[PDB]
């Protein structure tokens, strides 16, 4: 007879979190690799000198 | 989402690590030549003496 605002906006609260489920999986995992990345240079420093000596 | 600040500052360090690469790899050869020349002088007396002489 009525209700039916508060049952589609839950659900499309509930369809949003899964939209924006594997952007924020990439983005996230994008992240985590950004860093490997900086911890793998500033011993660039180390091994650039080792190699020039 | 968020995460470049760490991403971009180790990879400014790496390209810089790069730009710094040729300038140290002349500034350095060029050390190493200037003792060559070091140690071909200090021997011009021996030749000068024995010329004169």
Redesign the interface.
């Known amino acids: 007879f009525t209700l039916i605002e508060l049952m589609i906006v839950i659900a499309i609260v509930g369809i949003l979190a899964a939209v924006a489920l594997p952007a924020?999986q990439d983005?996230?995992a994008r992240?985590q690799v950004?860093?490997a990345?900086?911890?793998?240079?500033?011993q660039?420093?180390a091994v650039?000198e080792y190699y020039?000596n």
């Open positions: 924020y983005y996230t992240a950004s860093e990345i900086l911890l793998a240079e500033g660039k420093s650039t020039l």
